[PDB]
Write an enzyme that holds these catalytic residues in place. Structure first.
Site, short mmCIF file in Angstrom:
data_model
loop_
_atom_site.label_atom_id
_atom_site.label_comp_id
_atom_site.label_asym_id
_atom_site.label_seq_id
_atom_site.Cartn_x
_atom_site.Cartn_y
_atom_site.Cartn_z
N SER A 297 33.51 47.25 -32.91
CA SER A 297 34.03 46.31 -33.89
C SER A 297 32.88 45.73 -34.71
CB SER A 297 34.83 45.21 -33.20
OG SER A 297 35.67 45.76 -32.20
N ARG B 298 25.07 47.13 -40.08
CA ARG B 298 24.44 45.83 -39.87
C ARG B 298 25.08 45.18 -38.65
NH1 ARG B 298 27.16 41.72 -41.85
NH2 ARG B 298 27.87 43.08 -43.55
N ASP C 196 38.44 47.66 -33.93
CA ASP C 196 39.42 46.91 -33.16
C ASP C 196 40.70 46.66 -33.96
OD1 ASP C 196 38.48 45.12 -34.99
OD2 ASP C 196 38.02 43.52 -33.56
#
Lengths: 473, 480
Positions: A144, A159, A198
């Site tokens: 996620s 990132r 997710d």
């Protein structure tokens, strides 16, 4: 009782109001950012997940395992698909050491994925001692985080978020790295076949758990999250996913596929703040008390992490004006000391009880002794923060439904929206205020009545398991 | 293709429309009938123009956090007997074991000299056999609390006392009439050694639909999301709600005060709204509703509102419309077998037509009519038949919403808290399975006096098995 302070609070609450006009503006601007995001890089992220099919609910006779790397825990589970919308799930949970969130020059990415590999070996040894090294395990990985996913089983980290500091991981295929360490500990037979978000799992889970014949007119269309962060996904026509190379787009259409799930990552919506409601408090928090300043601006106005922080900054500004007395409180230098749970007790507290649930919440959170007249105003601020968060949380859902004409497909056409997250699940009234904004949005009251916000838990498990089902070992 | 028939159907469809103006009228008239029904007997009317409004003596609601206890329930239908055990696991979850059995044929025989003892003695043995099967080790120690579901007309005087009024569904046992069925069932439970099984509650299946949802309401916290209504929409209809003890003026003051002294504030009322406005002062009526109420009905003149919402009559209404259209040489029945086969058109048949699409020449409807009555049709005919089906179903869903809106208004259920919401427990083939029925109900609720802002705070969630789990949950907060 105190006209000076009262007028100050009334002025701040009005800055958090989201008018029907603004919902229309943001909904229209969101669809614009959606279309811009579907083009090759140069709008929203709009990340293809490469999930093209929806579970029917009748998949059976197979057992899959999945791994989920959250912000504070690591999780390993086994999902046995039994068909008929039922499933068995066993799992082993592990904490993420705290030294990974600091920038220790000795901590590396390998140490993290090696930690994940050992837990898998420990979990498989716990429940499946006999098939640990022979079985051809198919694993789904729920990562996620912002990822540049090029296929169903290949994705490089873009990132870190949620407090992570490991530079060597950025720009590297997280699935292959995780696979490198699974081989080292002797589990070469465990193949990471799927890399999912997710939100992608929240949607597929509800498809499997939905009803057989109700789904003829009641189709799940959006999977979203409203917790510490926010994000959502939906099915988009393959023809509109211009980021996809035409060859792969043509190959899927010829296989009977029509849509592909898009991980919008709408938390990064309007990072330029051309239209998002903004206050001095949202700015003071975005630059100072943020972990990734300049990023995920929409998320910081809707995330349960920042809702409590927003209130804190309001109170500090009110002390700067000699209007509120903190006394022995501990708010002066303690960001995030006000949590989403703390505000929850204030949201539904009653003035009939002298707002006792709120006084205790403030004492336990920051030893802030308060008066009845103070809690009445604090309540007004909390209810205004939550209302803006719920109203903005409705814009993405309304925009997606409008861009896909989901609400006008049949005589009794209805749609489901799968939700998970501390905020939407447990924050009182959040869903109620979302439905209200949907009525004020362009879809109208008649549109909301055909939209159902049903909560579906454990998206990172069953959802990841189903992705590994249709994948080849 | 046939403009004459088309215009005729458009005219018939318009007869089933329920306007916002009418919803306000019926909702207001329903509350009037509610208040009249709660007054002492013999006032203007023998038992008041109002609704039955029958106290069930259920004053407590399960919180959903009860755990560590096992409850029993007995259900005596018309053809089966059922005994089940509900183990409450807390967190809105529970384990359920049950055994369902047919009623021996010896109760349906003549001259056999069947008495109440023979019947309740059989039920006791079945209960003992069930407890020996699933709770072998604790059969004699546990302080079993049992809820009794007796699906027959009963004059309930307390939570655990109710005398049979009359047998139905083919039963002939004279010893039972005028006798406390709870006492009789308890008499035989003591004899076979189950004196520790106390029948503490005598419940209705609608009251159970509500209580079942109270325990299962897991989504929202009950501080703001309280279940308030339990209703049924299947072959028949009925609903219940919690009423302030002070407004139940028919209730004996002695019994009313004793409950107030125990901290109780409300009691569930079995409205029996199927008998709403049997005088037809306001209920929408058509020539088809009248011909069906008198001819093809089992109880003409009674349960008029129920016949406007029951899934049994929805298909029949369509049949009479088509027969009327054939009598006018507008519709050709051909070799169909509708002329003398009432109820041959079922709610299941209409289901395939409700959501069928004209994009497929309405093939699911062509097939549904052939299988149901060997009625060959043309595309232009099915387009109109669908218009009739969709118009009939919409009227039923709109009327099914009136009582819910009326009860919510009379109890200010939507204006109790800042984020106040309410749940409505539903069971029944129609509300559960008829496609879109629930959706059209929410629409009528939005048009009702509660308004669109009220509908958003109303949740029609389905709660099954009121006569089993529900009856068990009623016994939970009852005293041993």
């Amino acid at each position: 009782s105190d006209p000076k302070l009262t007028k100050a609070v009334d002025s701040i609450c009005d800055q958090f109001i989201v008018t029907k006009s603004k919902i229309s503006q943001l909904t229209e601007y969101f669809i614009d950012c959606m279309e811009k995001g579907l083009e090759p890089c140069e709008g929203l992220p709009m990340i293809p997940t490469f999930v093209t099919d929806k579970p029917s609910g009748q998949e059976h006779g197979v057992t899959m395992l999945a791994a989920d790397l959250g912000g504070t825990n690591f999780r390993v589970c086994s999902v046995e698909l039994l068909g008929n919308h039922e499933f068995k799930i066993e799992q082993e949970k592990s904490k993420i050491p705290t030294f990974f969130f600091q920038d220790d020059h000795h901590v590396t990415s390998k140490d993290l994925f090696q930690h994940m590999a050992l837990i898998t070996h420990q979990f498989l040894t716990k429940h499946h001692k006999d098939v640990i090294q022979d079985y051809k395990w198919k694993m789904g990985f729920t990562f996620s985080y912002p990822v540049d996913q090029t296929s169903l089983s290949s994705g490089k980290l873009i990132r870190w978020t949620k407090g992570f500091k490991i530079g060597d991981t950025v720009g590297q295929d997280v699935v292959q790295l995780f696979q490198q360490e699974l081989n080292d500990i002797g589990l070469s037979n465990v193949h990471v076949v799927a890399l999912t978000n997710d939100t992608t799992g929240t949607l597929l889970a509800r498809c499997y758990a939905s009803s057989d014949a109700a789904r003829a007119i009641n189709e799940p269309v959006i999977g979203c999250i409203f917790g510490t962060g926010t994000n959502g996904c939906y099915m988009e026509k393959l023809e509109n996913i211009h980021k996809l190379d035409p060859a792969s787009r043509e190959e899927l259409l010829s296989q009977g596929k029509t849509h592909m799930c898009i991980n919008t990552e709408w938390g990064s919506f309007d990072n330029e703040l051309n239209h998002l409601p903004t206050t001095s408090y949202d700015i003071k928090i975005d630059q100072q008390f943020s972990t990734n300043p300049g990023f995920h601006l929409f998320e910081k106005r809707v995330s349960g992490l920042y809702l409590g922080e927003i209130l804190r900054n309001i109170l500090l500004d009110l002390e700067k004006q000699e209007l509120f007395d903190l006394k022995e409180s501990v708010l002066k230098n303690n960001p995030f000391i006000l949590t989403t749970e703390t505000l929850s007790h204030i949201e539904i507290d009653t003035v009939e009880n002298d707002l006792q649930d709120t006084r205790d919440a403030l004492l336990k959170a920051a030893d802030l002794e308060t008066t009845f007249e103070e809690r009445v105003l604090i309540q007004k601020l909390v209810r205004a923060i939550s209302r803006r968060a719920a109203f903005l949380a409705a814009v993405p859902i309304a925009a997606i439904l409008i861009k896909t004409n989901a609400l006008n497909q049949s005589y009794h056409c209805q749609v489901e929206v799968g939700c998970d997250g501390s905020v939407v699940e447990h924050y009182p009234g959040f869903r109620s205020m979302m439905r209200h904004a949907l009525a004020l949005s362009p879809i109208g009251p008649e549109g909301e009545r055909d939209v159902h916000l049903r909560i579906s838990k454990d998206g990172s498990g069953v959802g990841a398991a189903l992705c590994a089902l249709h994948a080849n070992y």
